[PDB]
Each structure stands twice: as C-alpha cells, then as structure tokens.
RNA sequence: AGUCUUGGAGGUAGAGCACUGAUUGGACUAGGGGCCCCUACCGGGUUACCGAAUUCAGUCAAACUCCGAAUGCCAAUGACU
C-alpha cells in the first residue's frame, strides 16, 4: 500500500534529530515528493515529524 | 545512522510521613535550678525554665524516604537510509 509523503516546512531552525529523520525518509528539497510501503516503522517515522509533513494514501 | 519490537540498570517531577530532622498548633510535661512555699524543707504541681519523654496533627525539608513517572541512556530483530 503506498503512500506519498511530502516535505512541507523547511528544517532550517530544526534540533538535530528531525533533520536525521526528514533526510533519512528521502527528503532533500522542499516541495519535494515520494513514495514507500505502509508499515509500523514509517508510521513511527511520520509520527515523529508530523509538523513538516503532509501524507496523502494513493 | 533514523524508526519498530523485546530486555535492562536508575531515585527526580510529583506525592507522602514508614525514617530523620524542622518544628510549631501545641502538647508532653517529667524531674529538677527556680516558681506558691522557696530551701526555716525538700519539693506537691506550674515548671513559666530546662527538657526526659511524650503528645496528635499541620506542614516542612537545595543536602529526609515505605512509594514513584514522562523523557533521556545501554544491548538484542524487521523495515528505512
């Protein structure tokens, strides 16, 4: 089942660890778009940075 | 590296008096210097003090703990980079 995640906020002016999961996601530029697999662990990565994040189910 | 699951040390935010104090509301007031009388007599009790207790709280604890989080730390398995 997969889903779209797009970066929505800058990470200018971000502590560290939301950087590390915005980059690790695949994200490098704003407005920028991908897709991966639904499960428990990209439901947790979502989870913890959600403020910058807008998730749209294909 | 980031995330998920499982395991593990810890005594703080809170709360509480089980322990230590703080103490006071005050008790508990012995028993004494002393007070009524002293003591011409020791003291009967206050003791107007000490302070042995003890009294039931109330709180109180940046150097109190029967109790105890959220997060952070340390290792193990899938994804993701």
Not at 8 to 15: A, L, Q, T
Not at 27 to 30: A, D, M, Q, S, V
């Given at each position: 089942a997969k889903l779209e995640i797009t970066l929505?906020?800058?990470?200018?002016?971000?502590?560290e660890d939301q950087r590390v999961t915005v980059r690790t996601l695949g994200?490098?530029?704003?407005n920028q778009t991908v897709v991966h697999e639904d499960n428990a662990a990209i439901r947790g990565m979502i989870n913890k940075v959600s403020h910058l994040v807008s998730v749209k189910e294909q």
């Open positions: 929505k906020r800058s990470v200018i002016g971000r502590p994200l490098k530029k704003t």
